[PDB]
């Protein structure tokens, strides 16, 4: 009816009480790659769809949670990924997607432009002078 | 002729630690255990 109490007397908040307790970000490196991708999604869809340029100093938020779309009861034959495409991470989905050859092609173009005249060109000129 | 017996404080503390102060076997049984521990009989 009236018992002895137990004395349990021995920074940032863990759960946002005003947003129904979203946990703090456990910054796994997979989560860091996912957040790099989400800040970088203007490049992922290469040119076909642009996004509002949201760019802060830190791209990790203070509160996140990784999720998955469950289902639309009105669309379930083409609005639903197959089992062989349900990847665990967003970047795994992106690599399983197409246009990765397009990324590689653009990357090689930028690599040629940046190795244009830096040091291999000067070694070539020096050999052609000394010969 | 005898000599002073030697005892290990680990053994004596285990004997006294086997129960709390309340709800221990009574002091007669505890005394016989202590005397049997200290008894110099081969």
């Amino acid at each position: 009816e009236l018992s002895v109490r137990v004395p349990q007397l021995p920074g940032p908040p863990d759960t946002l009480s005003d947003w129904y307790n979203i946990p703090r970000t456990n910054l796994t490196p997979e989560l860091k790659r996912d957040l790099q991708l989400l800040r970088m999604r203007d490049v992922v869809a290469m040119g076909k769809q642009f996004f509002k340029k949201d760019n802060r100093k830190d791209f990790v938020p203070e509160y996140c949670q990784v999720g998955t779309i469950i289902a639309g009861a009105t669309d379930g034959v083409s609005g639903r990924l197959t089992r062989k495409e349900r990847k665990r991470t967003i970047v795994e989905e992106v690599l399983s997607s197409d246009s990765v050859s397009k990324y590689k092609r653009k990357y090689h173009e930028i690599q040629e432009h940046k190795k244009s005249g830096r040091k291999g060109y000067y070694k070539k000129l020096m050999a052609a002078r000394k010969r | 002729d005898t000599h002073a017996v030697v005892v290990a404080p680990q053994r004596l503390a285990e004997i006294f630690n086997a129960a709390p102060a309340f709800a221990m076997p009574p002091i007669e049984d505890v005394f016989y255990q202590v005397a049997s521990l200290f008894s110099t009989k081969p």
Binding site: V4 | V7, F22, F31, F38, K41
Partner: protein
């Protein structure tokens, strides 16, 4: 910062609250209620709940009626401690100490914890009587009630011997018996405090097996550890350490051995004497002093453990014969040889038996004759001890100047003993070279 030091001394010795925050905190410190309600809890409802608990206590046991008159009364609802003079405060300290010794037995019950919650939240026992309150809660040192008392205790009111609970107040976990006995074998202050508390309780006849077993265990492990400290090899240092141990212990063991009314504490004292004799190497006079007080102090309820302790004492003596009054009291023992066989089943009673035989031989009464005969036919002495015992017996029969008739009957009874002790008596007669026929004819004709 000498000024700061003297001021902190004043601030620690200060007793009353003097600003509203200190008042609120000192009223919020509580046992049963959480502090959130203990702040806003006034004295009427406190007295109602805890008086209900104290009523349950009076229907448990009878002797709570004086405290019903003086401590749990409708005027003690109102009385403030810090507005009374020093002598009123001293009389209040006596009444509080009496109630604490009385409530120490049933502390594991919610009624007793309600009564102590009243005493704390009104008379501020945790600030004015920390010594006796902390000693009374000491034997229950595992239960969550003791954990909460450790929480609410103010750090600077804890006296010096109990100042080893600082890490546990830092991390609220109940201190273990290893910690208690280690502080007991280092400081003599805690040991003397526990022994003083328990002797006070046993004088007031409010003891109980939990407290007695606690005190016995703590002092037993403490004496073990203290002798293990005192052993130092250099002859002078071990002599001084033996004297220091005995001066630190002697009154406690004396009163706990002479205290008849509580066989619990007398058996616990016997345990302490047994350890102190077997482990520590003492002197002959100290051992015979322990025996003299022990045989002055035992009773029927403690006779057989008392004989165990007497056995261990006589074993660890150096001389062979015992001192007198011990022989008188072991005459007074009813079933001596049966009890000694029961002990010799596990404890090697030989030296005690030999000392009794030499004492009775030196005693010129002849009302000891059945005990001497039973001890000699008991086969509890060594054969050399039996031989020298019979030799001294025949020497006393020669020394005597009726008595000769009784000793002649006993001597022919021993001479016609049958077993190995009869073998020993025969070879003793043969080695002393006297005529069994001369004694038989002189005593029979």
């Amino acid at each position: 910062s000498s000024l700061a030091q003297q001021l902190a001394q004043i601030a620690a010795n200060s007793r009353s609250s003097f600003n509203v925050k200190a008042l609120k905190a000192s009223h919020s410190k509580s046992l049963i209620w959480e502090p959130r309600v203990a702040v806003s809890q006034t004295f009427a409802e406190i007295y109602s709940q805890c008086y209900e608990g104290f009523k349950e206590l009076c229907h448990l046991d009878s002797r709570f009626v004086p405290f019903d008159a003086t401590l749990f009364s409708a005027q003690s609802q109102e009385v403030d401690r810090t507005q009374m003079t020093a002598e009123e405060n001293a009389a209040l300290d006596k009444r509080v100490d009496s109630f604490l010794h009385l409530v120490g037995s049933r502390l594991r019950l919610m009624p007793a914890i309600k009564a102590v919650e009243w005493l704390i939240r009104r008379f501020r026992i945790h600030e004015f009587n920390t010594g006796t309150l902390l000693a009374t809660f000491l034997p229950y040192h595992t239960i969550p009630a003791f954990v909460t008392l450790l929480s609410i205790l103010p750090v600077q009111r804890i006296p010096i011997e109990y100042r080893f609970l600082d890490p546990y107040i830092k991390s609220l976990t109940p201190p273990p018996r290893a910690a208690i006995v280690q502080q007991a074998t280092n400081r003599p202050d805690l040991l003397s405090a526990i022994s003083r508390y328990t002797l006070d309780s046993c004088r007031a006849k409010q003891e109980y097996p939990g407290l007695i077993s606690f005190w016995g265990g703590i002092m037993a492990e403490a004496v073990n550890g203290m002798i293990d400290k005192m052993r130092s090899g250099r002859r002078a240092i071990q002599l001084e350490n033996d004297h220091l141990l005995l001066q630190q212990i002697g009154p406690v063991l004396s009163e706990a051995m002479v205290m008849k009314d509580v066989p619990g504490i007398q058996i616990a004292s016997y345990m302490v004497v047994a350890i102190l004799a077997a482990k520590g190497s003492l002197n002959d006079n100290i051992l015979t002093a322990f025996m003299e007080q022990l045989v002055h102090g035992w009773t029927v309820d403690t006779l057989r453990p008392g004989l165990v302790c007497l056995t261990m004492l006589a074993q660890h003596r150096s001389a062979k014969q015992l001192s007198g009054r011990v022989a008188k009291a072991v005459i007074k023992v009813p079933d001596l040889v049966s009890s000694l066989r029961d002990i010799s089943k596990e404890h090697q009673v030989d030296k005690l038996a030999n000392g009794l035989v030499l004492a009775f031989v030196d005693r010129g009464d002849i009302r000891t004759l059945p005990v001497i005969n039973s001890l000699l036919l008991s086969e509890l002495l060594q054969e050399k001890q039996a031989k020298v015992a019979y030799k001294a017996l025949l020497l006393a029969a020669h020394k005597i100047d009726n008595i000769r008739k009784q000793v002649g009957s006993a001597l022919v009874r021993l001479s016609q003993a049958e077993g190995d002790v009869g073998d020993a008596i025969r070879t003793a007669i043969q080695e002393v070279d006297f005529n069994i026929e001369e004694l038989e004819l002189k005593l029979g004709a």
